[PDB]
């Protein structure tokens, strides 16, 4: 059934990831010198291209793929449109290698037909603390703590075959030149989420969505007057006034985060971080990078009591193209990134954000049910979609965990 899975260091069925007691490797251990040093063969009339992130032009190239040929929803009414200032914040973290960034293109035009990104992560991916008991309790306590320490790894996003190129089986070939040029740089694992289940993912959960203007989500049928709404007089008013929120933040001592925060945002988020079986590990240039606003790309508020940080919330911010509607062309939707919460309850700290995307004109809020997002869903008014978000490694045997034990945001 999977002529190119089956092939690759990942487990191969449910089955066999039940029965997966430890984290660490699958694949041979491998070493630098043994990996091909000439880029892997493609046919004569494409060509690989590394992209400069630092280029103009070919942050475009690439958003123009994105925009035409990326991830749709299910029903092909909404495709994402990552922006490219979007695409240089997310591509170029601190420390990030050019190389991991691969793409094709046709030789005679330069046409950008395939692109897949890798980026640096700092994974905490040992063995899960419900494995751990079971360890202890067989005397395996060393085997189970032996890839405890923080690994920097690959993270890979943004793969993407042109829709004119579609089922050539062009994407195991870019899957194979991303792996060959991060195992050059002496790493062997990755992570990447789909929405789509292949072989085999250690979490899963779903998507939720907040409606902060419900008319124009009606409108584009991202979501419906739901049947209940009938029994009413007059649907729409009272859906306004369902999801209405406050026009300000209710948190006394919330801000917009600046950089002279950085230290203190770090410490509390790697300590709540750390209560999750798996997640990022971030250095103060990381955390300044991932979570200082930028406009239209990144937005994070801080609770200041007493001139100390003791809470934070971010979202960040992808549009939709909204596949032909006459009133409306694009949703404008927020997702929520990294916070913690340290003196007021979670969902008094979410409140706050869906207050602030509200008053800057989002349409939703995105979640995939990860950290303690499933604490907030009913008092924030969060409804279950349609889609789901599954977490994969590449060359990591890993025992299934729930989502709320992922802390890895993906963007
Ligand atoms: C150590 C470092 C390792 C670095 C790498 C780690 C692994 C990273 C893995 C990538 C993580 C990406 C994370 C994200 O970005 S997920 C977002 C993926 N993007 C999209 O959905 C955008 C819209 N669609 C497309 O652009 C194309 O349909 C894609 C490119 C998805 C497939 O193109 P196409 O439809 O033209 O097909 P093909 O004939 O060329 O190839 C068919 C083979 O492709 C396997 N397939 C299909 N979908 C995916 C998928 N989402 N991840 C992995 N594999 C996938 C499929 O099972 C089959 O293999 P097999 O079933 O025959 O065995
Ligand atoms: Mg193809």
Known sequence: ???????????????????????????????????????????????WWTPNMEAADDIHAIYELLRDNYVEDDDSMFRFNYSEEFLQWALCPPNYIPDWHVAVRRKADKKLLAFIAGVPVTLRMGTPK???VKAQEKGEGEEAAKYDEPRHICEI???????????????PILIKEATRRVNRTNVWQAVYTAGVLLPTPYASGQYFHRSLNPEKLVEIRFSGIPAQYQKFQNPMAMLKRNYQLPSAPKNSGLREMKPSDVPQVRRILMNYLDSFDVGPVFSDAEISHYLLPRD??????????????????????????????????????????????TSIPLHQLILDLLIVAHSRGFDVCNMVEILDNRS?????????????????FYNWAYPKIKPSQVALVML
């Open 1 to 47: 059934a999977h002529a190119f899975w089956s092939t690759q260091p990942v487990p191969q069925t449910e089955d066999e990831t039940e029965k997966i007691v430890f984290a660490g490797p699958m694949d041979e251990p491998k070493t630098v010198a043994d990996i091909p040093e000439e880029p892997y063969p493609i046919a004569s009339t494409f060509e």
């Open 130 to 132: 419900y494995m751990k």
């Open 157 to 171: 996003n943004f793969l993407c075959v042109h829709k004119q190129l579609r089922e050539k089986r062009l994407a």
């Open 296 to 341: 239209g790309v990144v937005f994070t508020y801080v609770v200041e009591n007493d001139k100390k940080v003791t809470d934070f919330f971010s979202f960040y911010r992808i549009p939709s193209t909204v596949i032909g509607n006459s009133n409306y062309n694009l949703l404008n939707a927020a997702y929520v990134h990294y916070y913690a919460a």
């Open 376 to 392: 907030f869903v009913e008092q924030l008014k969060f409804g279950a979609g349609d889609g789901h978000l599954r977490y994969y």
